[PDB]
Symmetry: D3
Subunit: 299 residues, 6 copies
C-alpha cells in the first residue's frame, strides 16, 4: 500500500489489518512511554482549505509516534492566488517530508497529487481515515463488526461520511442497517441499489420511534444549518431527529457522531454511558497512528 | 413583473420589452443630464458572497436613475455566523429598501427570499440580468436577435452564463448555434436535448478553424485556472482556444466575453473593431437601469 | 438638544417630543414621495467596532430624509493601530460632516467625543436610539406608554438594552413591570432599588406561566450563546424561555424583541398577529429620521 | 486640464486658477445650502491600496457638489489576484463613472491608466491634490504665497509630501525656505541642487531654536515610527523636533501638518491660534471640490 | 496540584515549592544539554484570544523539557462561530494532549474547563504563571521575598498583573509596599482594605520623587495607550511616570516590568545594571518549565 | 562566523566551506536515519512579513538535524501595531532560542538586529541562503563552479536573487556570463561596471537564440506579473523568454529557477533531464542544514 486516497481502494482485508495495527498503537499509548517508531520522520499537512480538527488529529498521531510535523495551510496568497500549481507544491513538499496528508476542494486533486508525489499521500477529503476511525470505534466498543444492528439518523442524502460507512460496512457479514431520516433526505437511490445487489437487509424508517431497543449502534450524521436555506426546514429536521436524554436512557446502543456537534445531540446526553462520540474522537489518534506507520514502512 | 429570479420565468415578450426599455435608458444616459426617474428610491445590495463587479453595476445603474443605495455584503459574522437567517434579514431589509438585488450560494435562496420579501427581488446568482445584458448587446450591435449565427467558445460544461444564454436564444427564430470546445467540456447533454426538442440547428465542433465568416457572434466563455487542478489541462485549453489577433482580423463577427478576461483574449485584439467585450460591459448599465425601473413601477 | 449620548440626559418631555416627531416622519414615509428635509446634509458613521445592523438603520434613515452619508468603520490600521486618536478623528470628521453617529468600546468615548466635536454626536453604544425605538413601538402598537403591563423575559442581568428601557419606562405613570428570568439572570439589584425608590410596582417571576393574559407587552431580550461558556446553562435558559406558538395563541400581548433573533422565538410564531418584532424593526427608520432632523435643526 | 497626474504638469497659472476656484467653493460651503454643480455626476474611487483618509476627502467633496460616488478598493481577490489588469478595470470603471480618483503602488500606473481612460483621472498617489491643498492653506491663512518665510521640520529625507511642496513653492517669487531636521534626515541632495539652480535662498539648520520669529509658516512633516527600526533613533528625532506649547506661544507663524499627527505636535498646542493643521484638513474639501469640478467641465 | 487556575488556590507553600523547582530547571538550562524530563508528552495551547507572547513562552518551556506541542488559536470560525462549545473542545483536546494552557475571555471559562478536562489545565488568563514568574525574579535577584521594600508605579487601577502580585506578596513577612500612581489610577479600594486587614504597611504616594533609595524593587506596570481615550490623559501619566536614566543612576533598586514596554521605560535605561526586565523575561522559561513538570507528575 | 546577514560578508572560502558541509548533510539525509546533530537546539523564525516558502525550508532543515522550532510571524498587532520594537523582540527571542532566522522589510533591520541579539542571526531578506543554495546546485550538478558558461534569462533589472548570484560568481575563475533579456530589463549599469572591473567576460544578448549549446547553466529568473502594470509588457516578455520543451531538448545545459514558477517554464519541460529546478528546491534543505549547524557550533 502506497496511498490512502479512497475507501474503494481498500478491501475487507486491509481494513482488518489497519484496525488490528490500530489496536497495537492504542496499547502502546497506554504504556505512557515515549514511542519512537517514526523517530526520524516528517509529516507534512497540506491543507488548501483550513481544518484545525483534522490538522490536530494527524499532528498528534505523528508526534505520538515520535515524528515531526511541518504545516502549510493556504489556497490563498500562498500559491493559488500567486500562480503555483498543486503539482509544483506537491513536488516541493514531496522533497521535504516523508509523508503527506492532503486536503483539497477539487474532485481529483488527491489522485492527481499522488501521481507527482514521491511520497505517500493521505487524502483528508471521500474521507478514508474517518471511515476507518468509525469501524475501529464500533469494533472497540461493540466487540465485533459482523452481525450488528446499526441505525443512521439525519441527513443521509448529503451526508459525506455516511455513504462511505454504509459502503464499508456492506463488506461484512450480516449487518442490519436502519436508515432513519426525513423523506427529502433519504439515502441516495444508487446506494440503495448496491445494498440490494450485495443482498443486505435494510429498512427506511421515518421516525426515531420506529426503532426498537435491539439496535447496537446509533450513528447520528451532521445536520448543517447552512445546507438548509429555509429555516423552517432546519427547525423541522432538528426537532424531529435531535437525540435527547429521555430517548437514550436504558437503551443498548452506543451513540456515534463525527464531530462537531451543534444541535444533533443535547448536552445532557454526554454523561450517559452510551454516548461515545467523544471516545470515538479519541480513537482517531490510534488509527491515524496506524495508518501513518503502515504507509511509511510499506515504503 | 414582481421578481427577476430566473430566465425561465421570462418569455420572448418580456425580453423584448426589457430590451426596448433598456434602449430608452441608454438614450437618456447620452442626454448627460441628471435623471430622476427613481429619485426617492433605495436599492439594497444583499450579497452573501462578495462581488464588486456585480455590486458596482447595479449601484451605478440605480444612481444614474437618481436613486440611492444601501449595501450589505456578508455571510460571515454579520448574520449566518451569529444565527440570523436569510428570511429574517430579507424581512428587515425588505422594510428598509424599495428593491433588493440578492446574491446567495444556496440553490433556492432567491426563490425562498421572494416569498418573504415585501419588495421586488433581483437574483444576481442562474444570472438573468447577465443574459439580458448579453441579448441587449447582440441586438444593439448586430441589429437583431432573430436569425443570427453565434458561436460559443470555451468551457461550455461549467459555463454558468453560457447555459442561460443558449436557453434565452432558443426562444428566437432561426438562430444557428456553433458549440466549439474540447471534448471534456462539451455542452451538457440535457441542454443539447432541449435544443433538438425546440428544433434548433446547432453544431458541435472541436476546433476554432471549422468556422469562417458565416458567424455573427463569437461568444468566449471564462476559462478559470482554478477549475483545472492539472495545469497541463488548463495550458492545453487556453492554448487551443485563446482568441488571437491573427484569427480575428477581417472577420464578420463581434467578440463577446463577460469580464474579467485573463487569458481568453490577447490584449492586441482590443483595438480591432470586432472586439466588443468592453462595450458589452457598458451596456450592463442601461439594461440594469431598465430592470430596476421596470420592477419598481410594476409594483 | 445638541447631543444624544445617554438616556439619562433626556426627560419624559424630550422623549415625547421625539416620539411625536417620529410619528410625522412615519407618515411622511407612507407618502412614498421624495423627502428633502435634510437635502444638503451629510451624516458620518464612525464605528470603531463594526455593526452592519446599526450602520444600515441610520444610513437608511438619513437617505430617506434626502441626505448623504460617508462611512468610516475601523479601530484597526485606520487610526488606532497607526496612532491617530479618537479626538483628532472626531475633529476631522467634524469638519466634513453635519452630524456623527459614533460607536466606540471605551466607556466615556462618546462624552469625550462630543467635547471636541463641532457637530452633533449620536451615541450608538447605553444605546438611546434603541430605547426610543422601543418606546415608539409600544406607543404605536398599544396606544399609550402610561399604565401598561409589560413583561421582560430572558437575560435581565447582562441584558443591555433592557436596563435602558426599564429606566426610561420608570419615568411614566402606572407602569407595571414583570421580570421573568432564571434566578442567575435576575435584574441587577441597584436597578431594583431605583424602582422601589421611584415607587414602581414590579414582580420577579421565574416561569412564563406565572404570567396571565392581562399583560399588554411581552419584551423578549436577546439570549446570546456566547455569554454562556457552559452549554448546559444556555440550553436550560433557551428551553425554559423560548417563545413558542402554543404559548402565544389567543393572548392579548404583542411580542417585542430587538433583532437579531436566534433561538429566543420560534419561526412559527412569526405569522401570529401579536408578533411585532419585524414591525418594530421598521419603526427604527422613522424614529431615527426624527432624531437626525431634531439634532440638526437644534443646531 | 484633462488629468491631474503630477505637479510637474501644472504651472504657476493652473495652480492659481485652482486656488481661486477653491476659494469660491469654500464660500459656497458657508452658504450651508444644497449645492448641485455636479448633480448628475458619479465619482469612482479606485484604490489598489486602502486609504480611508483619502477616500473620505474626495467622497465628501463630491457629495458636497451634489454628485454621487461608487467605491472599489482592492488589489486583492478583486482583480489582481484573479487576473484582471489595471487597464481592463480602468476601461470598465471608465464606462461607469464620470471621473476617477486612482491610488496605485506601481510607478507609472496613473500615467498608463490615463491613456486607456475615457474619463479624467486624479492621481491620489506624487500627490498633487495634497500639494495644492497645502498652497491653498498658506495663501488662505498668510494672504499670499510669494515672498514668505517657511520652515520645514522633521523627516525631510523620506518625507513624501514635503518634496512636492518644496518644488511647488520654488515656482513663486522670493520664498525663503528653512530646512530644520536631523543630519540623517536632511533634504535629498538633488533637490537642494534644483533650489540653488532656481536661485532660491534656503538654510539647513539642525535645531528648532536656530529659527527666528521672522517665519510665516512652520510646516511639520510626519514622523512615522515605522521608518525607524532603531527606537533610539526615533526617540532622538521626536524629542528634538516635537512642537511644544512653550515654543509656539507668541510666535507669528501658523503651524501646518498633514494629518495624522501622532507625536509630532503636543495636544496642548491645539488651542493656540497659530495651530492650523485641523483648519488645513478642512481646506481639503474646498480645493478637492475645485479640482473635481475643474476636471469635469474641462471635458 | 492538578490545575493552576488562580493564585488564590496556591498557598505560600506551593509558591516556594514551584520557585524552588524553577531554580533547578534554570540550572538544567545552563547545562546546555538535551533535557528529556517530559520526552513523551504533548502540551496543547488553546487560545480563544491570540497571544504570541504567551504561546511562545510555554511552547519554548515545553520543548526545553523535551516535550512536543500542538497549537489551536481561534474563537473564530474554528468552533465558536460554527457552534462547537468550549466544553466539547476541551473534551477533545483533553484526549489528544497531556496538559493544556487555556486562554479564554469569559470569566469562569478556565474553572469550567477544568471540570470537563481529564488533563491539567493552566490558566493563561488572573494570570498565575506571570505572578510566579514575578516572585521568582525577585527572589532570584534580591535573594529573598520576605522583608523587601517594593514600589509599584503606573496604572494600579486597571493593572491586571499588579493586583495578582500585591496579593501574592501579602502572604510573606514584612513586605513594605509603595503605591506610586496618579490619583485617578490608585489601587482598588477593596485591595487596600485586605492589605490593612492582613496588617501590611503600605504607602500611597503621588510622585516618583517621594520614593527613597531604600527601595529594593521598582515594579513598573504597563501603561497602555488604548486604555486612555483622551490623549492628554495618556500624555500626562507617561510624562510623569516614565522611568528615565537620570532617575535610575546610582539607585539600589532593580527595575521590573512585564513586557512589552512601549513608553514606560526609556531605552537608555536598558544598559544600567538595575534594569532587569529582559532578565525577568528569561526567567519565565524556567518557572514555566517547573509548572509544566509539576502539574504533569502530580498526575 | 557568527551571523549570516550579507553575501558581501562571505569570501570564496566560507562559500566553499559551507558548500562542502552541505555535501555532508545531503549524504546524511540519504542515510534515512534519525540525525541528532542539533538535538537540543531551538530555531526561532521571526518573520515580519509572512513567507511560508522560507519558513518551511528552515523549519524542515532544523528538524532534520533533530532540533526544534518556535515560530512568530507578525508585524501586525503582535508588536509593531502595539509598540514593541524590533530590538525588544530580538532581545526576548534571543533569550528563548539558540539561533534566529529573521525576515524584515526595513533596510538595515538584520544588521541592527544582530547587534542586540545574543544568538546567531540568519537574514532571510539580500538573501544569502538563496545564493549559497544556487552555488551548491551548480557545483552539485555541474561538478565545478570555476570555469562554467552560465546564461541568465529574464528580468535582470529587478531580478533580486540574480544580482546576488552574478556577484558571488564573479569571485570564481573563468566564468562566462550571458545576460539574455529585453532591453528594458537589462542588468543594472553599476553591476556591469563591477564585472568589467573584475575583468569578467560577459555578453548582453536579446534573444534566446543568440545563445549556443556550449552553455552549462541556464538560469531563469522569476517574471512576476505584478511588476508590470501594462499587461502588454508582461506578455511581450513572457512570450519571448518562456522556456519551452522544443528549445530545451538535446541541449547540454541544466535549467535553474528559484521557485515558484508561474509562466517562466512550460510544464512539459519538467520531464526533461536538464530540468533541475525541483532538484534545486530539494538542495535547499542540505545547505540550510549546513548553515544552521555551522552558525551554531561557531558560537
Amino acid at each position: 500500500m502506497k496511498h490512502l486516497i479512497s475507501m474503494k481502494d481498500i478491501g475487507k482485508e486491509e481494513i482488518l489489518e489497519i484496525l488490528d495495527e490500530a489496536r497495537k498503537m492504542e496499547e502502546l499509548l497506554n504504556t505512557k512511554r515515549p514511542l519512537k517508531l517514526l523517530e526520524g520522520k516528517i509529516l507534512a499537512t497540506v491543507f488548501y482549505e483550513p481544518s484545525t480538527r483534522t490538522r490536530l488529529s494527524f499532528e498528534t498521531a505523528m508526534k505520538r509516534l515520535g515524528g515531526e510535523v511541518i504545516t502549510m495551510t493556504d489556497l490563498k496568497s500562498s500559491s493559488v492566488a500567486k500562480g503555483e500549481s498543486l503539482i509544483d507544491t506537491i513536488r516541493v513538499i514531496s522533497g521535504y517530508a516523508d509523508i503527506i496528508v492532503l486536503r483539497h476542494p477539487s474532485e481529483g486533486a488527491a489522485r492527481l497529487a499522488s501521481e507527482y508525489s514521491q511520497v505517500p499521500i493521505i487524502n483528508a477529503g471521500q474521507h478514508p481515515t474517518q471511515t476507518l476511525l468509525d469501524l475501529y470505534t464500533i469494533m472497540r466498543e461493540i466487540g465485533r463488526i459482523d452481525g450488528i444492528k446499526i441505525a443512521f439518523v439525519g441527513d443521509l442524502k448529503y451526508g459525506r461520511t455516511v455513504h462511505s460507512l454504509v459502503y464499508a460496512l456492506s463488506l461484512f457479514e450480516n449487518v442490519e442497517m436502519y436508515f432513519v431520516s426525513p423523506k427529502e433526505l433519504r439515502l441516495p437511490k444508487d446506494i440503495i441499489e448496491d445494498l440490494k445487489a450485495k443482498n443486505i437487509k435494510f429498512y427506511e424508517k421515518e421516525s426515531l420511534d420506529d426503532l426498537d431497543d435491539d439496535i447496537d449502534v446509533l450513528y447520528v450524521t451532521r445536520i448543517q444549518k447552512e445546507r438548509f436555506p429555509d429555516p423552517n426546514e432546519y427547525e423541522k429536521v432538528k426537532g424531529s431527529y435531535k437525540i435527547k436524554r429521555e430517548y437514550v436512557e436504558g437503551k443498548k446502543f452506543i451513540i456515534m457522531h463525527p464531530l462537531p456537534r451543534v444541535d444533533e445531540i443535547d448536552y445532557d446526553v454526554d454523561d450517559l454511558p452510551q454516548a461515545k462520540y467523544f471516545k470515538q474522537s479519541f480513537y482517531g489518534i490510534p488509527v491515524r497512528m496506524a495508518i501513518l506507520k503502515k504507509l511509511i514502512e510499506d515504503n
